Amino acid sequence: MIIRKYFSGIPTIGVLALTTEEITLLPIFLDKDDVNEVSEVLETKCLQTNIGGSSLVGSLSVANKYGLLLPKIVEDEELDRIKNFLKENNLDLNVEIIKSKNTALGNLILTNDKGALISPELKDFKKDIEDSLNVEVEIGTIAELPTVGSNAVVTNKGCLTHPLVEDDELEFLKSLFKVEYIGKGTANKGTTSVGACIIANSKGAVVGGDTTGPELLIIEDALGL
Numbered sequence: 001m002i003i004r005k006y007f008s009g010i011p012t013i014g015v016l017a018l019t020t021e022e023i024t025l026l027p028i029f030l031d032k033d034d035v036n037e038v039s040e041v042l043e044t045k046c047l048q049t050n051i052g053g054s055s056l057v058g059s060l061s062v063a064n065k066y067g068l069l070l071p072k073i074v075e076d077e078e079l080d081r082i083k084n085f086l087k088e089n090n091l092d093l094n095v096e097i098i099k100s101k102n103t104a105l106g107n108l109i110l111t112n113d114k115g116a117l118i119s120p121e122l123k124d125f126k127k128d129i130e131d132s133l134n135v136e137v138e139i140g141t142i143a144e145l146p147t148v149g150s151n152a153v154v155t156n157k158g159c160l161t162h163p164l165v166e167d168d169e170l171e172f173l174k175s176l177f178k179v180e181y182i183g184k185g186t187a188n189k190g191t192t193s194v195g196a197c198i199i200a201n202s203k204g205a206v207v208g209g210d211t212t213g214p215e216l217l218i219i220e221d222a223l224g225l
């Protein structure tokens with residue numbers, strides 16, 4: 001259920017990609033073998049696209065079963081490409097441009113299909129985020145850091161956080177995301193921003209290639225994989 005990958009040599013999987021239970025967004029530079037390997041382990045429909053001209057799809061965007069959030073820099077051709085892919089797959093999402101000055105939506109938001117956590121920097125966008133993602137949204141941090149999407153991985157089944165999350169915050173996250181599995185750890189040989197290193201859903205995960213055996217064990221347990 002879990003594979004280790006580099007994307008054209010880059011171990012920071014979560015900056016470059018995002019997934020839901022149904023779709024995965026990937027950088028255009030990946031070859032077809034890498035795309036097929038990701039599609040098989042996550043059991044998703046994969047779209048290769050830029051966002052804002054960029055391959056940093058996981059840092060710039062967020063999605064769940066209900067909604068897809070894009071930054072204000074998304075380009076018309078990119079929006080067209082994404083909506084065409086959704087239409088082709090009969091996927092009806094709330095596609096929403098979050099017009100924040102900070103365009104790193106994927107770094108600032110952490111969501112599954114049951115709850116979402118957002119950086120306090122995005123407080124004035126809370127209603128837009130709630131209406132698109134169609135889940136309970138709360139404002140907060142992870143291990144004192146406002147880049148909650150960079151510092152945790154969440155799926156419908158489990159959640160992995162930054163290693164310095166305290167038990168009271170772990171209980172809050174477990175409740176917010178309505179998951180039965182949760183844990184804390186590193187990826188890519190000690191990186192604490194585990195959301196930058198891993199994409200996952202309830203069916204599988206892609207973890208950055210430098211992730212060690214002990215780390216993989218903790219990731220498996222935290223995500224229920």
